[PDB]
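Researcher: Going back to the complex we discussed earlier. I've cleaned up the inputs and rechecked each line, so this should be the final set. Can you rerun the prediction on the complete assembly and write out the structure?
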Amino acid sequence: ALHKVIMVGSGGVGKSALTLQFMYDEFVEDYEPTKADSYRKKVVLDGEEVQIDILDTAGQEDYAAIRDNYFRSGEGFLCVFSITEMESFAATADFREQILRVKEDENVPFLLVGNKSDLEDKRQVSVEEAKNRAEQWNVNYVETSAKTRANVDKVFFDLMREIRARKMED
Amino acid sequence: TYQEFTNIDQAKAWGNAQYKKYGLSKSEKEAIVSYTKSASEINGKLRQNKGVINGFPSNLIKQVELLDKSFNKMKTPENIMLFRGDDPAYLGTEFQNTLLNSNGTINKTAFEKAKAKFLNKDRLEYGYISTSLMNVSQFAGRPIITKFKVAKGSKAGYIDPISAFAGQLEMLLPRHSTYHIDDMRLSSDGKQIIITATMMGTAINPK
Ligand SMILES: NC(=O)c1ccc[n+]([C@@H]2O[C@H](COP(=O)([O-])OP(=O)(O)OC[C@H]3O[C@@H](n4cnc5c(N)ncnc54)[C@H](O)[C@@H]3O)[C@@H](O)[C@H]2O)c1
Ligand SMILES: Nc1nc2c(ncn2[C@@H]2O[C@H](COP(=O)(O)OP(=O)(O)O)[C@@H](O)[C@H]2O)c(=O)[nH]1
Ligand SMILES: [Mg+2]
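Model: Rerun complete. Updated structure for the full complex:
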């Protein structure tokens, strides 16, 4: 089994840092903002050996045909914002709309990810507003830190479980 | 040395001479016309997303693609000075209602803070950068004036002949551009911050 994950979210939210923490258990600071890469690794998911496929999108130059292609190919989405940037939270609705427009399936595996949880002292987005949005969207909200590893494995594994459940029907 | 136009008719002559060679398509011109009507909205979304466009709706993302690619046809033939007017929020949210003294002069504390924040540093702009060939348009009265030093061969388009606001002598620069702030001073007026910056280039370079 291969579970195809797409990272989405505004520039600078931590998509790359999250991906590299998951992949190689390292905190990578200031990874090239406009650089995209794909990653693949074998994991044991609830006693079963599977592969995860992660596309860490850049997004600054992903025009209609490019983004539509990878939204269609993607099976699950980590929608990341930074808890320190309200604008990045506001933007999450846009990524989700565009994902929903191409997938025409509201039941798409999707997690809302509030990253940079170590930066509580600079928080701009309340837990209340994010949890409320997650409920409205019928998805889970998880707060992460690629710096401290907080909930990083959790979001990737939880999304995989959702992709797996969706594949089970049928 | 960077050309700096001292006369509107000369600037227009130079601009028209560049424009004549662009050979823009119908859809490219339409995207540009629409930009001149909607810049702050398009640039607002680019800034909100730090340049990421994959959440943009169809109409907006196609406009961005057309704008981006039109710069393959629009380059400056020589080193040129471009002028830009900005409002206080350009310096940051903390400057928005904070830049000006009650008598209309730039506050010296605000200025010193801005100088520490930006001087001798690179700055990245997520939006397209609207500028003018001269400093006599309606934007010349804004509290922040930027003089951009734009090198020969750089992506830069004279779009006045198709702008919804002819007379602005508009030179558009690509989005996602970095420039280095070389100098920051107060006008003799004390009413404006004058910034001199060297344009470095854009990250958006489609085939
Ligand atoms: N401003 C100029 O000197 C200039 C030059 C030529 C043409 N124009 C015309 O004016 C319109 C565009 O106006 P504009 O240049 O103010 O649009 P803009 O999108 O660049 O800026 C909109 C507002 O945001 C501010 N701003 C700019 N960069 C910012 C940043 N990085 N962070 C926070 N705020 C920032 C601006 O000062 C302005 O108040 C277009 O129709 C264009 O044709 C403007
Ligand atoms: N303090 C802190 N910084 C982070 C975290 N995640 C990412 N960063 C930093 O935030 C910036 C943007 O991160 P990046 O992963 O490149 O964001 P991306 O553009 O979405 O891929 C970089 O300077 C990272 O080092 C985090 O959880 N905590
Ligand atoms: Mg990245």
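Model: Worth noting: The first helix of chain B runs from residue 8 to 22.
Researcher: Good, that matches what I expected from the previous run.
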